[PDB]
From a paper:
The P protein is thought to be responsible for the recruitment of the large polymerase L onto the viral N-RNA template through direct interactions with N and L. In addition, P chaperones the nascent N, which is sequestered in the form of an RNA-free NP complex. For all members of the Paramyxoviridae family, the P protein is an intrinsically disordered polypeptide which forms tetramers through a central α-helical coiled-coil region.
A single diffracting crystal of HMPV Pced grew after 140 days, suggesting degradation occurred in the drop prior to crystallization. Diffraction data were phased by molecular replacement using residues 169 to 194 from Pcore, revealing a tetrameric α-helical arrangement consistent with the modeled structure. The asymmetric unit contains 2 tetramers, with a solvent content of 40%. The residues 158-168 and 195-237 are absent from the structure, in line with the flexibility observed for these regions by MDS and SAXS-based ensemble optimization. Additional stability is provided by a solvent-exposed network of ionic interactions created by Glu173/Glu177 and Arg175, or Glu180 and Lys182 side chains from neighbouring protomers. Comparison with representative models from the SAXS optimized ensembles, as well as with the best scoring models from MDS demonstrates Cα RMSDs ranging from 0.9 to 1.6 Å over aligned residues, confirming the accuracy of the modeled Pcore. The structural data presented here indicates that the α-helical tetramerization domain of HMPV P (residues 171-194) is considerably shorter than the highly conserved central region of the molecule (residues 158-237).
Residue numbers in the entry:
A (entry chain G): 168 to 193
B (entry chain F), C (entry chain E): 170 to 194
D (entry chain H): 171 to 193
Write the structure that this text describes.
């Protein structure tokens, strides 16, 4: 926390992309 | 690179994950 | 339309994913 | 509450991540 909304959101999005990449291998 | 643009993309990803998960064997 | 509206929707999707992920185990 | 929403979202993500590893 204390990283701002813009930077905090970047990570959420990059974490979701990882999950999608991993899921698409099934 | 906009809060609105970033959020839309996030929403898309979540729905995609849900769609992929519903089909999970 | 509106950050708060999307954020609520995003939160709802995350909860759904959690339930499913817990269900798969 | 926005700053509060993000914290809640961030916490759901952690569980999801952990659960993926449990797969």
């Amino acid at each position: 926390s204390s990283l701002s909304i813009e930077a905090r959101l970047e990570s959420i999005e990059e974490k979701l992309s990882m999950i999608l990449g991993l899921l698409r291998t099934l």
